């Protein structure tokens, strides 16, 4: 009945945060939908290597963002008090939904 959306550039920290949230929630009574891996989004930048010419060099860079889902069911009062108070790693962003 309450939805957690997790975003991050890294997958290690994102997985760690997802596990922490799901564990804290499950331990606090109500059932958990669990970490659903949503498809990641990739932006590609192709830039000529040389500063002047030689347009046949074209280094490739990518920026990828990962997405998770948790979707806690039957929100416990103690659950809803423990959430919005947890501390996140430096990368992970949390969105709250009903």
């Amino acid at each position: 009945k309450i939805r957690i959306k997790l975003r991050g550039f890294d997958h290690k920290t994102l997985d760690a945060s997802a596990q922490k949230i799901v564990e804290a929630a499950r331990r606090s009574g109500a059932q958990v939908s669990g970490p659903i891996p949503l498809p990641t989004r990739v932006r590609r930048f192709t830039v000529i290597r040389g500063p002047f010419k030689h347009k046949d060099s074209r280094e490739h860079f990518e920026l990828r963002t990962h997405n998770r889902l948790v979707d806690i069911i039957n929100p416990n009062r103690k659950t809803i008090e423990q959430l919005m108070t947890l501390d996140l790693p430096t990368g992970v962003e949390i969105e709250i939904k009903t």
């Binding site: 550039f9 930048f45 830039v47 000529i48 290597r49 500063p51 280094e59 490739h60 860079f61 920026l63």
Partner: protein
Amino acid sequence: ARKALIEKAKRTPKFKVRAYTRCVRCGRARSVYRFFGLCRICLRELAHKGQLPGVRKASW
């Protein structure tokens, strides 16, 4: 990338269509990216340095 041009680029130019973008790092006006506000050369430098979070060399 004269100083005058860099400064002129940052004012409301009496019109919308007179507005353009420059590399926020070196003032290059040619090959900038909306996402970063950096030119291609500065993009490459900062991406190699590791100062652009989440950005890595691609291989598929």
